[model samples]
Target chain A: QIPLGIYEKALPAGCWLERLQLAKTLGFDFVEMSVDETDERLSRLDWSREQRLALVNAIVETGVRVPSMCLSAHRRFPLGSEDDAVRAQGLEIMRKAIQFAQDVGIRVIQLAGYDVYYQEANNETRRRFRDGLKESVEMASRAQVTLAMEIMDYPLMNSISKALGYAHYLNNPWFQLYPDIGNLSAWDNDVQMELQAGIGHIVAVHVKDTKPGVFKNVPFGEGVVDFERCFETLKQSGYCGPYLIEMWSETAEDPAAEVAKARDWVKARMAKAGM
Target chain B: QIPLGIYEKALPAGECWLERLQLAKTLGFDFVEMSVDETDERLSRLDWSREQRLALVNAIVETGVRVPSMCLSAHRRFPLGSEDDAVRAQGLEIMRKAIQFAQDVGIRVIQLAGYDVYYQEANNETRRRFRDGLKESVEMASRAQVTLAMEIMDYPLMNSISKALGYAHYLNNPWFQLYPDIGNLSAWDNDVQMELQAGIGHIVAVHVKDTKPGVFKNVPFGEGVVDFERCFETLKQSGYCGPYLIEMWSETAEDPAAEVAKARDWVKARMAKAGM
Candidate 1:
C-alpha cells in the first residue's frame, strides 16, 4: 500500500534502462523524473518519437514506471518575468512539458510555486502567471493529465493552507497540490495543521528533511521534521498517496549503495511510525 | 538627525497621555504613535473633547516628544471591503472620524491598515469593493489636509510596496503614500533592497521591527533575519529622512522599561554602525 519512490537524481547518471533497472534493484517502486532548469534535462522535451519509444522499452524491460515529473524549468524561464521574451520562452516550455508528460506517461507534473522568482513580484507579474497557469491547465485537460503545484520555499505557497486558495482559484479536478514537507517545515508553518487542511486536495507528498532556513540536502533523521507524526497524521486522514523521497547526493562515492541505505532508512522509519 | 518613535501600546496600558509621552522620552524616543485598533476604548479616542485634545498637544510640547502619527486600525472591525453595505458605511464613517482625530490632535500622518477584509473570505469581490472605499477615503483625507499612508501589511494582499504601488498608481493622489514595515517586507522573501528602492520617493514613514519568515509579531530585534544596517543603507542612499517608528509590544514584560530601551539600542546600534 505504501509506494515509495526515489528522485531521479538520486541514482547515478545512466541510460534509461540502467536507471530503471537500478531503481528496481534498490527496491524503489518508481523514479520521479526531474525536468529541472538544466541543459540536459531541458533537452528531454525535444526527444524524437523513436527516442521516446526507447525509454518506453526500458520501462517495459525493467517493469518500473516514471509516474510523476517535477517540472521545475519554470524557475529558469519564469512565467511572470517582466520581459516579454522571457514570458514567451516560459509559455513554450510549458507547452513542451505538457506534451512531454503525455508522451512519457507522466500522470502528475509538479509545478514550481513561484509566480516570478528572478524579477520582483507585482500585480502585473501575478496576472501573467495566472494567465499562463490557465493555459497550462487547459493543455493538461486535453491530455487528461494532472498538474499539481508544489508548496515551495518561497512565501507565495509555502504551506498547504496558502496553496489551497490557488486550487480554489483554478477550480479544476486536474489541478491539485503536491505538499513538500521539507519546504513546509522550513517556513515554520503549522505543518500538522497544513497536512490536515490539505486532506482531500493533496496528490502526493515530497518526503524529505529540512532545517529552519535550509531547503535542500538534509539527510533523513538529521533534520527537524518528525517523520513519525507526518505519517501518523496522513494515515489517519485516509491519505494513501505516494511518498517521494527527494534527495540530492551528487558527490556520493557510491550512490547506489547510498540510495539503498536511504531506502532502508525510510522503511525502518515507516515501520517505526506504526504504518 | 532622524526622529525615532515608539508605538503607543509599547508603554504600560495607562490612559494618561502625558505619562505615555514622558515614557517615550525616557526611552530615548523623540515621538510615539497612538493606535486605534478593534476596541471600543480606542474608538472613543476619535471623539475626544477639545480640552482632551489640548492636553495631548500640551504633553507633547512639555516632554519634547510628539504624537506624529496615528495607527487607525478600527477598519479591521468595520472592513472597507465588507460584502454588507452597512459594514462598508461604518468603515467610511470610521475613516472620516480618524481624519478628524488626526487633524485636531496635530498629527501629521495617519497609517491606514492595508486590509480589504480580514474576517471574511478574501476574493475578487472583496478587493474590488475595497478599492471603492480606498479611493473615496483618499479624497476625504485630501480635503482635510491629513496625509493618509497605507501600512505595508503582513497579509499576502499589499504585503510588498510593489504590490501597493499598483493601488497607488490607480488612486494617483498626492495625499496617499506608503508607510512600509521593513520586517514585513523581508519576511515575505521579497527582494527587500529592491522593494525599498521602488518606494523611495513615495515613502512617507517606516515601521522598523524584526520578524522571521511567517512570524510577524514580537520577534526580538536581532533574533530575526532583518538586516537593519542594510535597510538603513538603502534609505540613507535614497535620502529618506522620515519618521522611523519602532513597533514593539510589552504588555507582559518583566521589565518593559528595560526591554524597550534594550530594543531601541538594537536598531540604533545597527544604524550607527552603518554610518546612517
Candidate 2:
C-alpha cells in the first residue's frame, strides 16, 4: 500500500511534537518538514544535537516518520548565482541541510529546480546550477541521502524533459525527480507524457490544486487540475511511492479538519483511479 | 505638523508586536499604519481582546510611535460587491470589526481600497452594492468616531481621484473622505496635482510610494515616473496637512531598518523641495 504524507507547514505554529501528533491524529502516515528562507525556518540548520534528537524522539514516539524534507531555501540562495560568494553560501547551506536530514533520519531531500529566483535567469546561471547540483549529489551520496529535484512552474527546469536530462547527466542513483502535478497542470503540460519521462527515476509526488493561469494556493476543486486522469497515469506507471498533499492551513478556520477532509477526497480519487 | 508614517508590512514578520512598535520608533517614523489583510496573522488582529488591544496601545505610547490608521485590503478577498451573500456578509463584518478595532486602539482613520469586487469583474449590480456597503460603513465610522477614507487604487472603478470624490460626495457623510495613493495615480498617468486639488476638504490621508507607468509595485525613489515635486507642491497648495505613509515591502532590501531610513530621507527631501 502507498503511504500518504502532508507538509508540516500546514499546521499552526507549534512544537515539532505537537505537529507530528496532529498529523498522526489526522491520519497522515508521514510529515514532510519545511526548511524555507524565513529567518525562523532557516535557523533550523543551526539547531543543536539535543534539539534534533528531541525532534527525532517525538517522531518515534508519535509513530509518524519524517522521511523527507522540502528544501525551498534555494529560492533565496540559488546554487547557480553569478556571485561566487552567493554560490558558495548556497552550497554551504545544502551541505549543512544534508547533514541535518541525515541526522534526523530523513532519507530524501527535495531540491528546488530554479537556478535563481527574484533575479535574472540566464545560460551562465543554468551552467552553474548543473555544476552546483553535481557537487550536491556527491555530498548526498556520501551522506547516503537521496536528492530529488522538483519541477517547478517557472521557466527553469519546469518540464519533465528538462529534469530527465539533468537526471541522465548526473547519472547517480541518489538523484531523482519529484514532480508537482498542480504546477504541471497550471502550465498546461501533458501530464501523462511528463510523468512517463521520469519513469524509473520518479521519487515522490506533490499534489495540489491550481487553475491554468493561477498557480499559487488555489482553493481545491475550484481549479482545472484533472487529478483523476493524473492519478490514473501515476497508477499505470506502477509508482507507489508517497503522495503528499500540499495546501495552506491559514486559509481556513480549522486547518486540521480541512486537511482531514482533503485526505478523504484524495483517497477517494486514488481508489477511483484503480490505485 | 503633517505626520510621516510607514506601513507595518515594511517590517520583518517574525517579531513580536512590542518589538515592531519599538522598531518603528527607532526608524524615526511618527507612526505605523497597520495592514489588515486575509492572512492568519492579520485576521488575528481583529480578534484581539480588550486587554490585548490595550497592551498594543500601551506599547505604542511607550515607543512614541502611534498606529493612527489601518489599511483594510482584505475586502479584496471578501468583497462587498460579491454575488454570494455569505461573502458580502463577511466583508461587512470585517469592516465593522475594523472600525471597532480602530476605536479600541485609538486609530482615527481606516483606508478602504476602492474596489467593488476583486478576482471578479464589476457590473452595475456590484457597483450598487459597493455604494450601499459604503453607506453602511460610514454610519459605523460615524458612531465609532473614526473616519472611513476611500483609497484611489489602480482599478477602473476608482482609479482616479475624481472617482473617489464622487463616492465620497454620494455618501455625503463627515466620516467618509478620500485617501489618495500618489504612486498609483502616477502609474495610471492621472493628473496628480488636479486630483489633490479636487480632494480639498475630503482628503484624510495620502499613501506615498514610487511607481512607473502600469507598475504599482514600489520602487526606489527617483527610479519611478512619480513627480514627487509636483505631488508635494499640489498638497502644499491645496492646504492638505494630513499624514503620508510610505508603503513598501522589507524583503527586497538586505537591511530593512536601513531601507526605512533611506525612504524617510528621500521623502523628507521631496517634501522640503516642494516647500511643505
Candidate 3:
C-alpha cells in the first residue's frame, strides 16, 4: 500500500506539536515538508529548529519517517538561472537545505528546477537553466539527498514532455522524479505516457484535480484529468511511494476540510487501483 | 452584455506599450490603451505619441466605439504614500489620458488606485497611508478627464470601517466614492451596509465575485457574501452607475474561459434584478 500523507503548511491552532505524533499513530507512514534556506526574510518561520527536531523526534518515536521533502529553494532563488551568481546561490541554498533534511532524518528531496518567469528569462536562459541543474545533481550526490526532480505542465510548468526528457538526461541513480498529476492538465500532457517514462524514477506523488472550469489546486476528481488512469499506470509500473494530497482552498471554505476531502478522494482512487 | 472596455495592466507582459495593444486585440477587445503618465517610459518614446495616435485612429475607423482607458498613476513614483501630490498628478494624467482616449474614440475612463494598506494606520508607520489617501481625494476630483474615483480593499488597503469611514468622510465631489465592489472592501468591516453608504455619488465600476470566507477571496458565484440586490440598491440610492465585471484569476489555472462565462452569467442575473 502507498503511504498516504498530507503536505501541511503548519499545524493549525488548538493543536500542539504532538499532533504530528498523533497523525502517525492514526496511520501515516510519513509526512512531507517543503524545505527552504535559513534566511529569515526569505523563508517562512512557521516551525523553528527546536520545534522541527522535536517534531522529527516525535515522528521517529512513532517509527514514521519523513519520506519526502520539497526543495523549496527555487522560491527564494531560482536554481535554473542564466546568471552565474544567482545559480550558485541557489545551489548553495539547496546544499544547506538538503543537509538540514539529513539532520532531520529525511531521505528524498524534491528538486524544483523551474525558473521564476517573473524575472523574465528568455530561451537562452532556459538552456543555462539545464546546465545549472546538472550541477545541482552533483551536489545532491555528495549530500546523499535523493533528488526527486518534478515534471511540470505547460501552464503551471514548461511542458511535461520536455520536463520528463530533461529528467531522463540526469541518468543519476541518486536523482528521481516526483510526478504532479494535476499539473499535467495545465499543459494538455498525456498523463499515462509521461508517467510511464518517469514512474521508475518517481519517489513521491502529488494528487489534485485538473479539470476545465476547475483551476489549479482544486479538490481531487473535480477536474478533467483521469485519476483512475494515472493511478492505474503507477500500479502497473510497480510504483510504491507517498501519495500526497496537495489541494488549496481559496474561498471562505475551511482549509482542513478541503484537505480532508482531497485525502479521501485520493484514498478512494488508490483503492480502486489496488494500491 | 457587458460593454467593451480596456483595463490597466492589460498584459502581465510588463512595461510594453505595443504588447498592451497587441494583447487587447488578441483578447478580442474593440480597442485598448494604457493610462500612462507624462513620465511613463512608453509615453516618452520619441515616436510613441505619433504612432499611438495613428493606431487609435485606425482602431476607431475599424471598431466604432472606443473601449475604455486604463490609468497607471498608482504605479508611478506617487502611489498611496504620496497620496495628495500623487492624486494631483494622477488627476492630470487621467485628464490627459481621457482626452487621448476621446481623440482615439474611447468612451469610459477608469482610475485604478494603488497598493495602500488601510489598516496600517493602526500604528504610526501606517497612519500616513490612511491620511494620504484621504488627503488625495480632492485632486482625484478636480483633474477632469473622465470620471475619477478610487478602489478600496480589505487587508492591504484599510483595516476596519473606521478608516474607510474616515477616508470617505473627506470625499465631497461627484467624482469620488468607492470605485469597485464592497466585497473587495468587506475584509475590514462587518457592516457591509455602512460600507455601501460611503459609496454615495462616487461608486463607479465594480469587480464582481463572492468573498464570504475572507476578503478578496473570489469564490464561485452564489457561494460568498456579495449581496447583489442590497449592493445594487445602495448604488441606485447613491445615484452611482457602472459595469460589474468579473476579475477572478489566480497565480495558476487550466482555462480561464469557464470562470469568465460563469462570472458573466452571475453578474447578468444580478444586473437584471437591479434593473440596469
Best-performing candidate as measured by lDDT: 1
C-alpha lDDT (0 to 100) for residue A152 of candidate 2: 87
TM-score of B-chain for each predicted structure, in order:
0.97, 0.96, 0.61
> Candidate 3: which stretches are off by over 4 Å?
A10-16, A25-27, A36-52, A83-85, A153-160, A212-215, A249-256, B1-276
The sequence of per-residue lDDT tens digits that candidate 3 reaches over residues A190-234 is 668887766545567777777643446554555777888888987
lDDT by residue for model 2 (A99-194), tens = 787556565689999898978999999999999998897676444456888878787777777788887686554577788888888775787899
Weakest 10 consecutive residues of candidate 1 chain A by summed lDDT: A137-146
The count of residue-pair clashes in candidate 2 stands at 0
Residue pairs with colliding backbones in model 3 are A211-A223, A211-A224, A252-B213, B117-B156, B117-B157, B118-B157, B118-B158, B119-B158
Off by over 4 Å in 2: B1-276
Cα deviation at B9, candidate 2, in Å, is 61
lDDT, model 3: 0.53
lDDT (Cα, tens digit) per residue for candidate 3, span B196-239? 66544234455555676464654666777678767767755554
Q: TM-score for every candidate vs. truth? A: 0.50, 0.50, 0.45
Better of 2 and 3 by lDDT: 2
